[PDB]
Amino acid sequence: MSLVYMNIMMAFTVSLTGLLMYRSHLMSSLLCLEGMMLSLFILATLMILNSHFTLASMMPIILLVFAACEAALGLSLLVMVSNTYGTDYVQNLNLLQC
Amino acid sequence: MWFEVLPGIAVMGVCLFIPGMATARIHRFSNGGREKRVAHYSYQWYLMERDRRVSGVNRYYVSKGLENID
Amino acid sequence: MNLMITLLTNFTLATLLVTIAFWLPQLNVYSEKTSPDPMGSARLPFSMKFFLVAITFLLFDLEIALLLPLPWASQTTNLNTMLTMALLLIFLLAVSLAYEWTQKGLEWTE
Amino acid sequence: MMTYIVFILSIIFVMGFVGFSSKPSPIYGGLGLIVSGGVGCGIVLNFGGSFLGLMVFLIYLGGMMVVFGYTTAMATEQYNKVVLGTFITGLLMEFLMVYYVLKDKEVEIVFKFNGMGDWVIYDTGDSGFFSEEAMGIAALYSYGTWLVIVTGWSLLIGVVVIMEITRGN
Amino acid sequence: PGIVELPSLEDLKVQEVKVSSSVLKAAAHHYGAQCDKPNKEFMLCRWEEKDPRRCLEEGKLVNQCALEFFRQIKRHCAEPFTEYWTCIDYSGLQLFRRCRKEQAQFDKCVLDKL
Amino acid sequence: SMMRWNRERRRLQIEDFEARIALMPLLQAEKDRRVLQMLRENLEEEATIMKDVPGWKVGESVFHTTRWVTPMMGELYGLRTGEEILSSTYGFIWYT
Amino acid sequence: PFFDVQKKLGVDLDHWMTIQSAEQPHRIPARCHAFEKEWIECAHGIGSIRAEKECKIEFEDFRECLLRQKTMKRLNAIKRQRDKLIKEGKYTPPPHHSGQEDLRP
Amino acid sequence: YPTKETAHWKPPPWNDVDPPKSNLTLNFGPQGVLRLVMELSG
Amino acid sequence: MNPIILIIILMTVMLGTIIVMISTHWLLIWIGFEMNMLAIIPIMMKKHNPRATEASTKYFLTQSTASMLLMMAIIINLMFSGQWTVMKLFNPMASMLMTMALAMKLGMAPFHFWVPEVTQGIPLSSGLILLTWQKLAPMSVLYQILPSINLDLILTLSILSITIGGWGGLNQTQLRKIMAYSSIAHMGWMTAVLLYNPTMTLLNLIIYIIMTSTMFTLFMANSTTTTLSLSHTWNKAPIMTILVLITLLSMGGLPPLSGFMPKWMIIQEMTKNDSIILPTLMAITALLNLYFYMRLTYSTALTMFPSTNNMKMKWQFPTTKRMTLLPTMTVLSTMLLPLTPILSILE
Amino acid sequence: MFMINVLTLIIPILLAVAFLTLVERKVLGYMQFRKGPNVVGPYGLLQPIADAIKLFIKEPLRPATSSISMFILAPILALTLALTMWIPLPMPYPLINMNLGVLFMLAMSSLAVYSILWSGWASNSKYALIGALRAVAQTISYEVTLAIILLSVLLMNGSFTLSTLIITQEQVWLIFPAWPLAMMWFISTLAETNRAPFDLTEGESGFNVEYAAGPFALFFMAEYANIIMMNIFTTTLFLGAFHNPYMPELYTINFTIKSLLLSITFLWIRASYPRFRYDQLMHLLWKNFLPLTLALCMWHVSLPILLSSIPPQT
Amino acid sequence: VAAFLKNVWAKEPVLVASFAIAGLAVILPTLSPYTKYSLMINRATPYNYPVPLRDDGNMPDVPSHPQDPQGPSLEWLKRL
Ligand SMILES: CCCCCCCCCCCCCCCCCC(=O)OC[C@H](COP(=O)([O-])OCC[N+](C)(C)C)OC(=O)CCCCCCCCCCCCCCCCC
Ligand SMILES: CCCCCCCCCCCCCCCCCC(=O)OC[C@H](COP(=O)(O)OCCN)OC(=O)CCCCCCCCCCCCCCCCC
Ligand SMILES: CCCCCCCCCCCCCCCCCC(=O)OC[C@H](COP(=O)(O)OCCN)OC(=O)CCCCCCCCCCCCCCCCC
Ligand SMILES: CCCCCCCCCCCCCCCCCC(=O)OC[C@H](COP(=O)(O)OCCN)OC(=O)CCCCCCCCCCCCCCCCC
Ligand SMILES: CCCCCCCCCCCCCCCCCC(=O)OC[C@H](COP(=O)(O)OCCN)OC(=O)CCCCCCCCCCCCCCCCC
Ligand SMILES: CCCCCCCCCCCCCCCCCC(=O)OC[C@H](COP(=O)(O)OCCN)OC(=O)CCCCCCCCCCCCCCCCC
Ligand SMILES: CCCCCCCCCCC1=C(C)C(=O)C(OC)=C(OC)C1=O
């Protein structure tokens, strides 16, 4: 198949490995998650436009809307834990080990 | 009195008249004395490319009419 | 083709102006200044109001993205369905605004 | 090299993804994500999706990454080896993949990809007096009644949920 | 699998309607009115056979009929049609509403001549 | 005023569309003849080139059926210069 | 569980999008309408187990329309042989493949 | 079964409530004239 | 929390589950999943303490990762098939990605690390809602795509889930963590029997739902969240001690109780396909679940732990909690074995 | 040849910005019973040149910026987005004819707030950051009503193309059927470019307090270019002119006069009223402008259906 | 019911205007006699080709030429 498909898959894999290995902050995890969504957007849009599937052109808009609502919920959770601890570090979310 | 703001407004009006006039004159000059053809949809672009291919000069604004048919 | 040429021209003109605006008084040798906000070292206070208005803007922006294809969609043959769906979407916008209004969501930044 | 414009843009896209995925700082990650989103919108525009690319600019960048950077400015108070290491190794795998693609004009990692320019897959016909993607999006109010209903209900419920959980009571 | 069959280069040879887009647009309504039968036969063959190699001869007949249409235009109404397609060709979007007067002149000329 | 002018604009649009409908059979015939000529020329040059390789059939379809399939853009312009490729594939998108 | 509420109630909630060969606005065809129609007219009513083996050639044709790996490979081989013959100097390109053809219409 | 790793593991609270672990102060200088010290709560 | 807002949010959770169940489009499956998760987040954060926000954060991150993997599988399937009908998949990579996404959503091992912490951090009612209702939609999606599921992957996930759940539940003293590890083991059983006869999977899902609902309802009726606070129940209401004894015996699969029927029919199905080592291993591993159930019954019903002085003050007042459907699910989770051939209604 | 068109677009923008500074000073002076600059040149015609040279030989502040990257990048983005929002403007022929030029403009305007965000974050002052956050919140909150108003106005046009907007107003001005939208659009564009009575950063720290005099001048020039662009866009939307296809100079002169009058109305507004508070303008937007914008949006969706006046798609 | 409208129109006139405009927008298209004109104007716009039908012998309604009397008419659109 095509080449830009390979580049978008590799971009998605890079963002997934970024999400799956936290460094210090929760915001970097959210950024990696939203980059994953952006790669999904580009891949689906290219496939739908190249395939001339007319009625599938509405799908990336719904995908963008739902994942941005997801991101709003995640930002609210990040703000709540930052108000609790004074920072958004992932090492402070360890009370539930016990 | 109040008519002394008029030189500045006149300079501003000249500087706002310049880009539109330049754009219209450039479009008319570069397209053989006609407007720049609008191609918003693929049918209009297909007509553009057909006219370019039928011109014989590889130039879409050289339009040939009844002088070409036998 | 012409569009990205214009974009490159605007970008390089802006970066040329910014470079001349930065580095031209750098050629002056004026002086060396020591210089030893009303708050000295206070932490930025986290305000829920600014975050709340940001998230409300984001959600209304999403429903705006939903509302955007109305000029194209008005050309459909199924006009009753399109009118009903458009009115339902803007009614949901109004209902979300009213729920934010009644539960003191728009409070102290009204 | 001008026939490879979408391929070059995809290379810039994945390079920006490597850059922001190394997590140097949340604000620099946001800047890299903004640049990557702009390049991806360029990819979509060069493929023919004007409306979807302008949705990416209007909603993802102008409407949502603003909220991300706005929240980033309200935390992560202003003033590494790992970041540089992963950036370098990601650039290395990326350029190795590019060299292996362009040297043999075929590659297999998980699926089989072809190294020719991506202008080959395009359609040779015209769409008439309309654009196909605009009609497909515009069919949302005529065909996608159920999609409109579930999306609007989810958006309203999201407003209610965000108002519920940030109150603290 | 199989070997795709293509017509020879002599079978694709025909003399063309070598007129521009605005020349076609100026006489589009009269071309649709006068040369309708071979055009509709070609379109029916095209939508039925789903194969241009089975509609090559119908397309050839379409070219012949269009060429005779323009020859008949040239015999009697060359000058009003020339003015009409000129003022059509000036417009950027090629509007029909910017050239009503020359359109009426061309229609009257071709009504009393043909 | 908007109602009257928009009704007139709708009538003008209908007139323009029906002019295009009257025109386009000729364009369809010309497009079919042009793409058939392109395919024939590419097949002849493939016959000239693809000769040294053993087990190569000139003009072998990739599909299992004999139904006509619309040619790819790379099937037509794949043997031509890069300027025509740029003008055909990205020509409409890049046009202003 | 897959509760077929739509078939029980007669509503059409997502069947319009579910395939590419369905009813599209303004009668716009897709690139692989015919192949998908043939594959669906195969697989209808015989189950997945029989349709995975009985007329698989329709699905191979549909997949070849969708992704076009064989056409890309054939073009790659033709262009590679052309490049080798051009470099070794026993092939001259024709005038119509170098931009000197003055195309038909 | 407590181990060496599970030695700092406290039990959860009885009501499952952990403790939550001021306001802004601004010094508007003299930059008539007047200095102001403002204790602001948003 | 407002009663009306709570009602709307709960109907939104059920609406998301219904949208997943009834739809024939992959995008609608995805939409139902996000609607369900977005609506269920405020149920977890009903009490507003740091533990609930931590549990909500971990749940959100896990579900978002699983959802992105699901969308990736859907897009790959569209690329290799050109359609969106919810049926068998046309790519092994799409099948693997979707199977691991559904495993992450179900919380099966080795993606199990979020289940006990999330269950511990949230109240008993929200934990019941999670561990009972949240698992109806991924099992339905798995029920729709079984021709494309890799057998080795799903069987590895099943045996890993059973062993890890038993070994994890051996060490816990909090009741919610015990319930979480029990859930992990039961989903291991359910997806073990999935590829041979999914009707057995439906029967096991129904029985596990009823037993978990009974145990959680008894827990909120007595307001106990630890082992010792549950051990105080003998001096307050001994009928509840009898009920938790019989329900915990039935949860261990001991005949002739109704919990014996799912593993009995699962072993019956697995031996028809000449798989004998795996059902024996799963039974021997389920002995560990029986072990910590029996430890709970020792601490609660079969011995009398010492009580305190204020139990008299608690004696002087009756209970007023709405123990909804508690006798019905108490009866249905213990004396349903003579009605075993009723499983033919699920085919 | 095209670069000549680009240059003759972008250089008169800077010239018009400098003379807009001069015109605003003189008009405010004559409106406050005094004179503007008339000593530096004949009626102050040499004032922008002297002011520009003075600002470009001024000592830089040299701040202790947290990030020199976005400190550089914020004026880059401000100037690029100020200059790039002129290319689909029909004058009467746009330089870049766009099928979706209106939504392209909306995307650029939504993207314009990153300059404020990065300028606030780059400066080490926390009060500067707070002022930047407040300005960003006001800007996005007025983006919302900009989008709804533009969407509701476009239902009389039929497409997103800016050149069709001339064709729509060939009969009558669009301010006749949509004057409440015109008033709300004018106030929303006034609050969009951070102008009085909404310029809160000048009332009691700006987002660019630590920026040097040169980059401050670049930011201010970008803001004035935004003002001129918005007024030209408003003139195209609501006050469309008569366009002769054989004489484009008629349309050029007509819309130039109208847009200059609208910009003079901006300066007239800025010297008549006191400033709003932050909560007062938030109240004016979320509780006054938004419900009426939604009601008028529903009205202008449902109106062309009931009048049999759907504009043509193409 | 009557003094409530006067009080709410004296106090919040913006909300009164918004709700009145909304009610007009939601009840007027179901009441106007021009909605059917919008319907048959939208459905009479020729986007794609009118593909001809093969003449079996029994189609008196289908014309054999555009200028034939039988067929759909847009005289109602020309007059309105
Ligand atoms: C582009 C063309 C020119 C535009 C105008 C330019 C010149 C005028 C400039 C004016 C001054 C600008 C500077 C100040 C800006 C800030 C103040 C401001 O604008 O506040 C807005 C004010 C703010 O309102 P407010 O704050 O006074 O409201 C009071 C609210 N409470 C009580 C809660 C405090 O008004 C509006 O928002 C109204 C917007 C326009 C409404 C248009 C309604 C049209 C008629 C509808 C129908 C009515 C009849 C009833 C129904 C009939 C149904 C059939
Ligand atoms: C193939 C299968 C397809 C699907 C088939 C059907 C599946 C049905 C699945 C049922 C899932 C039940 C989920 C959990 C209960 C949902 C209702 C709810 O929200 O209950 C919690 C609620 C919280 O209220 P609150 O007052 O805060 O409680 C704290 C204690 N004071 O209220 C309370 O806490 C009140 C106290 C009593 C709660 C009792 C709830 C019992 C629910 C389970 C009934 C039995 C299972 C369903 C029937 C059999 C299905 C197989
Ligand atoms: C699109 C249109 C944009 C237009 C922008 C500009 C608008 C304003 C135009 C200029 C208006 C008049 C300015 C007059 C300046 C003063 C001229 C003068 O006489 O200066 C005299 C001064 C001292 O002379 P001195 O020899 O010492 O005198 C002793 C003799 N008794 O000698 C000196 O100071 C030295 C010589 C100074 C000469 C200055 C000349 C004017 C400079 C204008 C710059 C911009 C020009 C336009 C650029 C854009 C268009 C090309
Ligand atoms: C190699 C040789 C060249 C070397 C480099 C020099 C280039 C040319 C620089 C400008 C000309 C040099 C002389 C400058 C002025 C000197 C004479 C002077 O002082 O004239 C004073 C006179 C006004 O007198 P004043 O003292 O103000 O009295 C008030 C009324 N009672 O003032 C006036 O009448 C007006 C003076 C105007 C000065 C010229 C116009 C401004 C500069 C234009 C060019 C530079 C800027 C171009 C645009 C940049 C972008 C804005
Ligand atoms: C910190 C980094 C630097 C920051 C400053 C610089 C970047 C930000 C400021 C500039 C923003 C530029 C935005 C460019 C995209 C805008 C959308 C667009 O191109 O629309 C025009 C047009 C679509 O309209 P339409 O009429 O349908 O097309 C012709 C159809 N016959 O589409 C076309 O005509 C398509 C033409 C071909 C494709 C062009 C692709 C452009 C290059 C990619 C994006 C460049 C910007 C990347 C960075 C973003 C911001 C970080
Ligand atoms: C059914 C029609 C279509 C409906 C859907 C479309 C709606 C479009 C408009 C959307 C508006 C969204 C926001 C609405 C908020 C209303 C609630 C509200 O604000 O109540 C509070 C307010 C009193 O104000 P206060 O409590 O002091 O708040 C601070 C501001 N002063 O309370 C008030 O001022 C009283 C508000 C309620 C009474 C309004 C009555 C208006 C009647 C107009 C004539 C009838 C119109 C026909 C429709 C029936 C209306 C009942
Ligand atoms: C290419 C560079 C052109 C020159 C720069 C822009 C024009 C100069 C603006 C100077 C200026 C003037 C005149 C001015 O009057 C003013 O006060 C409102 C400013 O802000 C404090 C200014 O920045």
**Residue owning tokens 């830089």:** J60
- Alpha-carbon distance of J61 to G59, in angstroms, equals 70
Q: Report the separation in Å between the CA atom of I129 and the middle of ligand 2, taken as the mean of its atom positions.
A: 7
Best of B3, B6, B9 to disrupt the J interface (most J CBs within 10 Å) is: B9
- Alpha-carbon distance of H37 to A83, in angstroms, equals 26
Tokens of I126: 């929200």
Instruction: Name the residue among D153, H24, I262, F72 with its Cα closest to residue G32.
Output: F72
Separation in Å, CA J174 to CA D86, E114, J234, J294 = 57, 46, 11, 19
Tokens of H40: 């602001």
> What are the helix (H) ranges across J211-289?
213-238, 248-270, 278-284
- Alpha-carbon distance of J223 to B36, in angstroms, equals 32
Neighbours of J222 (CB within 10 A): 22
- Alpha-carbon distance of D119 to J21, in angstroms, equals 50
Q: Output I256-260 pairs: Cβ under 8 A, ≥24 positions apart.
A: I256/I337, I257/I333, I257/I334, I257/I335, I257/I337, I258/I207, I258/I211, I258/I332, I258/I333, I258/I334, I258/I335, I258/I336, I258/I337, I259/I207, I259/I211, I259/I333, I260/I337
- Residue ranges of domains in chain D: 4-166
Question: Of all residues in chain H, what percent are helix, strand and coil, respectively (each to 5)?
Answer: 5, 25, 70
**Which of B4, B6, B9, B11 best tests ligand 3's pocket when mutated (most atoms within 8 Å of CB)?**
B11
Cβ distance C55 to A72 less than 8 Å, yes or no, reads yes
Separation in Å, CA I275 to CA I187, I192, I278 = 19, 11, 6
Instruction: Name the residue among G68, F71, A47 with its Cα closest to residue D116.
Output: G68
Neighbours of H1 (CB within 10 A): 5
- Alpha-carbon distance of J15 to J11, in angstroms, equals 6
- Alpha-carbon distance of B67 to E71, in angstroms, equals 11
List all chains that touch chain F, counting a touch as 3 or more CB pairs closer than 8 Å.
Answer: B, C, D, E, G, J, K
Tokens of J167: 């064709």
Q: Which CATH class is domain A1-86?
A: mainly alpha
Instruction: Report helix angle J68-83 to J213-238, nearest 10.
Output: 30
F32 shares contact with chain G (CB less than 8 Å):
no
Tokens of G53: 């083996």
- Alpha-carbon distance of F37 to G62, in angstroms, equals 26
- Alpha-carbon distance of A32 to A38, in angstroms, equals 10
Indicate contact of D with I: 3+ CB pairs under 8 A.
yes
J197 CA to centre of own chain: 15
Protein residues with CB under 6 Å of any ligand 4 atom: J 39, 46, 49, 52
Give backbone dihedrals phi and psi of J161, rounded to 5 degrees, phi first. -75, 135
Q: Are the C-beta atoms of residues J81 and J13 closer than 8 Å to each other? A: no
Instruction: Name the residue among I26, I144, I17, I21 with its Cα closest to residue I74.
Output: I26
- Alpha-carbon distance of F62 to F69, in angstroms, equals 10
- Alpha-carbon distance of I252 to I293, in angstroms, equals 7
Cβ distance G19 to I83 less than 8 Å, yes or no, reads yes
- Alpha-carbon distance of C108 to D77, in angstroms, equals 25
Instruction: Name the residue among I67, I70, I98, I93 with its Cα closest to residue I80.
Output: I93
Whether residue I318 has a cis bond before it, omega within 30° of 0: no
- The reported resolution of this PDB entry, expressed in Å, is 3.2
Q: End-to-end CA distance of chain H, in Å? A: 50
On the CB side of F43, CA atoms within 13 Å amount to 19
Instruction: Name the residue among J190, J205, J227 with its Cα closest to residue J134.
Output: J205
Separation in Å, CA D133 to CA D138, G27, J152, J232 = 8, 14, 22, 30
Partners of residue D108 on adjacent β-strands = D112
Residues in chain K: 80
CATH placement of domain D4-166: 1.20.120.1200
Whether residue I110 has a cis bond before it, omega within 30° of 0: yes
State how many domains chain C has: 1
Whether residue I338 has a cis bond before it, omega within 30° of 0: no
**Residue owning tokens 């080959």:** D120
**Residue owning tokens 């909603």:** D59
Cβ distance J114 to D34 less than 8 Å, yes or no, reads yes
CB neighbours of E95 closer than 8 A, spacing ≥ 6?
Answer: none
Question: Of all residues in chain B, what percent are helix, strand and coil, respectively (each to 5)?
Answer: 60, 0, 40
D154 CA to centre of own chain: 23
Residues in chain A: 98
DSSP string, A5-53: HHHHHHHHHHHHHHHHS--SBHHHHHHHHHHHHHHHHHHHHHHHHHHT-
- Residue ranges of domains in chain B: 1-70
CB neighbours of I80 closer than 8 A, spacing ≥ 6?
Answer: G63, G66, G67, I90, I91, I94
- Alpha-carbon distance of J230 to J262, in angstroms, equals 10
Partners of residue D113 on adjacent β-strands = D107
Tokens of B7: 């030189």
J312 shares contact with chain E (CB less than 8 Å):
no
Neighbours of F46 (CB within 10 A): 18
- Alpha-carbon distance of I30 to C2, in angstroms, equals 41
Tokens of J87: 């290319």
DSSP, collapsed to helix, strand or coil, labels residue D113 as: strand
CB neighbours of J247 closer than 8 A, spacing ≥ 6?
Answer: none
For residue J314, give the DSSP letter. -
Q: Are the C-beta atoms of residues I252 and I293 closer than 8 Å to each other? A: yes
- Alpha-carbon distance of J231 to J237, in angstroms, equals 10
- Residue ranges of domains in chain A: 1-86
Residues in chain E: 114
Q: Does residue J178's CB lie within 6 angstroms of at least one atom of ligand 1?
A: no
Neighbours of D124 (CB within 10 A): 17
Q: Are the C-beta atoms of residues G104 and B54 closer than 8 Å to each other? A: no
- Alpha-carbon distance of C13 to A76, in angstroms, equals 40
- Alpha-carbon distance of C66 to A65, in angstroms, equals 8
Q: Which domain holds residue C14?
A: 1-103
Q: Does residue D114's CB lie within 6 angstroms of at least one atom of ligand 5?
A: no
Instruction: Name the residue among A33, A41, A35 with its Cα closest to residue A77.
Output: A33
- Alpha-carbon distance of I282 to I185, in angstroms, equals 10
Q: Which ligand is nearest to the Cα of residue J49, counting in written order?
A: 4
- Alpha-carbon distance of J196 to J198, in angstroms, equals 5
DSSP string, G6-66: HHHHT--SSTTTSBTTS--GGGPPPTTHHHHHHHHHHHTTSHHHHHTTSSHHHHHHHHHHH
Element (H, E) at H26: strand H24-28
Element (H, E) at I70: helix I50-81
Contacts across the E-F interface (CB distance below 8 Å): 96
- Alpha-carbon distance of J293 to C28, in angstroms, equals 54
**Residue owning tokens 């007047």:** H34
**Given H11, H16, H20, which is nearest I51 (Cβ)?**
H16
Q: Are the C-beta atoms of residues J194 and J201 closer than 8 Å to each other? A: yes
Partners of residue D112 on adjacent β-strands = D108
Cβ distance D143 to G72 less than 8 Å, yes or no, reads no
- Alpha-carbon distance of A61 to D159, in angstroms, equals 19
Q: Which amino acid is at I36?
A: N
- Alpha-carbon distance of J67 to J271, in angstroms, equals 37
- Alpha-carbon distance of H41 to H29, in angstroms, equals 19
Instruction: Name the residue among J284, D158, I45 with its Cα closest to residue C58.
Output: D158
G65 shares contact with chain F (CB less than 8 Å):
yes
Whether residue K63 has a cis bond before it, omega within 30° of 0: no
- Alpha-carbon distance of I186 to I188, in angstroms, equals 5
Distance, in angstroms, between F82 CA and closest chain E CA?
Answer: 25
Q: Are the C-beta atoms of residues J44 and B8 closer than 8 Å to each other? A: yes
Q: Which amino acid is at C57?
A: F
- Alpha-carbon distance of I239 to I244, in angstroms, equals 9
- Alpha-carbon distance of C109 to F72, in angstroms, equals 58
Q: Output J256-260 pairs: Cβ under 8 A, ≥24 positions apart.
A: J256/B13, J256/B16, J256/B17, J256/B20, J257/B13, J259/B16, J259/J228, J259/J231, J259/J232, J259/J234, J259/J235, J260/B9, J260/B12, J260/B13, J260/B16
DSSP string, I134-195: TTHHHHHHHHH-GGG--HHHHHHHHHHHHHHHHHHHTT--BHHHHHHHHHHHHHHHHHHSTT
Separation in Å, CA B55 to CA B28, C46, D61, J314 = 19, 68, 45, 27
Q: Report the separation in Å between the CA atom of J220 and the middle of ligand 7, taken as the mean of its atom positions.
A: 7
Element (H, E) at D106: strand D106-108
Residue C104, classified by CB atoms within 10 Å of its CB into exposed (0-12), middle (13-18) or buried (19+), is exposed
- CATH code at C43? 1.20.58.1610
- The answer to the question of residue C64 being in a domain is yes
Instruction: Name the residue among D154, D20, A33, D165 with its Cα closest to residue I61.
Output: A33
Give backbone dihedrals phi and psi of K34, rounded to 5 degrees, phi first. -105, 5
Separation in Å, CA I140 to CA A60, I94, K44 = 25, 17, 46
Q: Are the C-beta atoms of residues J240 and J168 closer than 8 Å to each other? A: yes
Chain K interface with D: residues with Cβ < 8 Å: 47-48
Residues in E closer than 8 angstroms to J93, CB to CB, are 92
Q: End-to-end CA distance of chain J, in Å? A: 30
